[PDB]
């Protein structure tokens, strides 16, 4: 009986977690976030997760978002079963508020991600819960004005990347995001002062056009920079996203 | 089938929950019992069960409050539990306040006591359905299935041979415009007679029957007084 989330398989694996991770990738929602100099950006495909419910028929797409904001400074982009994603945001929205209440200062973008993975693992070890099929990013700005970016999975794993993707294209997105982040590093201009608009946001956007080969209709993504001089995880209006979608004649 | 049956949590691949559907045919094994709503009165009659030639007939009609009475059909003990709940509910309301418990808000309080026995895996859904016959401002008849559900009716029948008893009721529109309880009680008793199979025991002064109406608290029909009704039935 490998039905449990606890009983180790004879080879030692936990087959439930591997099943839980599979269910995340079944949603085929891509979410990419990259980190820059004093700026972090995040994108998601702004679509309803492919489920038993009928596909997009009569909804108002101005209310389907895979990105939330845990506090006024720490955003996130949960991806998974839509029921579990909302539970993760609310559990996150509590651990961040409890930390602020009991310590008098905002939680770091990484401690908040480390707390969840402690809550997440508790489900994994015990037998009478179910794995929250919800893996997502968490971004924010620490006390040193350095941008942060962490990823956590149905298994407790709070690695924390510098340019990460969650969804179902990790087979190739490991490489497309690998080489395309080197380009910004390779340029030795250093004249980019608070120039995140044309260096980080467009980098993540042109990173999405390559992971999935669509043309990115502006009503199919939302970006949320948390750069310094904002520090507030603002969501960028669609009037500005389509500006970067016109940046295909000279960028990529 | 063989698998989606053991516990009361598993949903069968058709979305049908078996263990409450299996407990919803325990009422089908209970004796018939009919409730008829007049314009101003409610009449409930039920055929008691004589399990042996020596045994007294069991109880099919229970009183709850001054104007509220029920009638079980199913596992007797599971029915007894819900009586003590509603009795200890109307009494509480008659004590907490001085009003009489609102009949609809009493059914909900018992129509959702079934559910809390359905959600958990360590409890079984009650077997019994009920006919909550009561008069608060307008005569009313409610039924609560083993699955948490309730309805307001004009006539009923439970289980044993309720198919035939429904036929008499589903065709009769007399009941509303019919004053003269005497005529209504004959309307109700004949319906019960339809369920009672022939070549067998006939309706005698050992079948429970009670009324409740405008200035009529829920009251039995005494053996001496019910006897003359039985004569008017056979004709």
């Amino acid at each position: 009986y490998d039905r449990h989330l606890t009983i180790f398989s004879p080879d030692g694996n936990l087959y439930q977690i591997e099943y839980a991770i599979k269910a995340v990738k079944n949603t085929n929602i891509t979410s990419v976030g990259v980190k820059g100099e004093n700026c972090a950006v995040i994108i998601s495909q702004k679509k309803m997760a492919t489920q038993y419910i009928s596909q997009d028929k009569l909804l108002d797409y101005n209310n389907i978002t895979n990105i939330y904001n845990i506090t006024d400074e720490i955003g996130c982009s949960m991806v998974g079963m839509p029921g579990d994603c909302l539970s993760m945001v609310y559990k996150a929205r509590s651990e961040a508020s409890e930390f602020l209440y009991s310590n008098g200062y905002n939680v770091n973008a990484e401690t908040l991600c480390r707390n969840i993975c402690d809550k997440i693992q508790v489900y994994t070890q015990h037998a009478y819960m179910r794995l929250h099929a919800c893996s997502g990013m968490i971004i924010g700005i620490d006390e040193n004005n350095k941008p942060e970016l962490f990823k956590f999975d149905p298994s407790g794993f709070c690695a924390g990347y510098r340019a990460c993707v969650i969804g179902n294209k990790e087979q190739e997105s490991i490489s497309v995001l690998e080489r395309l982040l080197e380009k910004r590093k390779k340029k030795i201009q250093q004249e980019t002062i608070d120039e995140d608009i044309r260096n980080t946001t467009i980098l993540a956007i042109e990173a999405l056009q390559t992971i999935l080969a669509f043309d990115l209709k502006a009503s199919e993504i939302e970006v949320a920079i948390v750069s310094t001089k904002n520090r507030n995880f603002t969501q960028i209006s669609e009037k500005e996203i389509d500006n970067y979608l016109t940046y295909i004649a000279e960028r990529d | 089938r063989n698998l989606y049956d053991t516990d009361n949590i598993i949903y069968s691949p058709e979305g049908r929950l078996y263990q409450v559907e299996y407990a919803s045919e325990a009422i089908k094994q209970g004796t018939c019992a009919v409730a008829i709503k007049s314009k101003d009165y409610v009449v409930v009659s039920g055929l008691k069960k004589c399990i042996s030639k020596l045994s007294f007939p069991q109880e099919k009609i229970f009183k709850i409050d001054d104007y509220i009475g029920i009638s079980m059909s199913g596992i007797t003990s599971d029915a007894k539990v819900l009586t003590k709940f509603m009795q200890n509910e109307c009494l509480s309301h008659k004590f907490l306040y001085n009003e009489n418990i609102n009949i609809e808000s009493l059914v909900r309080s018992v129509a959702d006591k079934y559910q809390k026995n359905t959600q958990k895996s360590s409890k079984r859904a009650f077997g019994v359905g009920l006919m909550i016959a009561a008069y608060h401002n307008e005569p009313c008849i409610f039924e609560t299935r083993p699955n948490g559900s309730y309805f307001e009716y004009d006539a009923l029948s439970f289980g044993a041979r309720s198919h035939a008893s429904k036929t008499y009721l589903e065709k009769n529109l007399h009941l509303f415009e019919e004053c003269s309880l005497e005529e209504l009680i004959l309307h109700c008793l004949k319906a019960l007679k339809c369920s009672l199979s022939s070549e067998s025991e006939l309706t005698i002064s050992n079948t429970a029957l009670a009324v409740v109406g405008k200035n009529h608290p829920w009251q039995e029909i005494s053996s001496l007084q019910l006897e003359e009704y039985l004569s008017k039935v056979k004709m």
């Binding site: 108002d60 909302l86 539970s87 | 949590i9 959600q119 958990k120 948490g148």
Partner: protein, 240 residues
Amino acid sequence: GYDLSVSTFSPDGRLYQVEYIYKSINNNNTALCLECKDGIICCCINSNMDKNKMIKKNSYNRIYHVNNNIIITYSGFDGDARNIIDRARSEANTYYYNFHTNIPLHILVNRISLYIHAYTLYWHMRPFAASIIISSFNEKDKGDIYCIEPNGACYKYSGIVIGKNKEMFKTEIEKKDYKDINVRDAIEDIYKFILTSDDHMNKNNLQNLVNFSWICKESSYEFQNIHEEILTPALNKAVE
């Protein structure tokens, strides 16, 4: 083999015992709720109650409300739905004790969606088996209709049918821009559906089976069961 308990993921990842619920609510009495230029009109076609012929005239109602300005219908188990409403009223009362203001809609839905979802996480608890539609209208902001499925997944709509015949109703609601068609005359267009679009089980005798109420400018934007003297002129269904 993996579909016994709700707490075990299927090897494909498709968590069974939650999709089985979808089959159940897709085989119960349909419920409809769309937004008009003046307000939200709901609907509930209890098409499975036509055997009984003994129900009271208009007893069985699925258009529950809360705070007298939020409409909560459903389509599923009559018990599991009522449990949620009791929570929904309780969730709204707890808000009023603590904030002196009726709970705004777009967070009541969450605190229910969590409540629905939280039951799909245990060995023992049986997951809820009832979808929920939550709606309200404001004069400053036009109305909004939230649909909730088993296992959370609250979504915002502008018109939705849930129940047995939900599919081809949806193809027929979107024929007209009901966000401009007024609520007062939108009832007739709904009847032209139920009469034909249902499973032919509602013909000319439906004044009791279908029961709907709106929230519009006629009610000063408050939950108002529609008087029968509006329904009868709206039964100008003489077709063919």
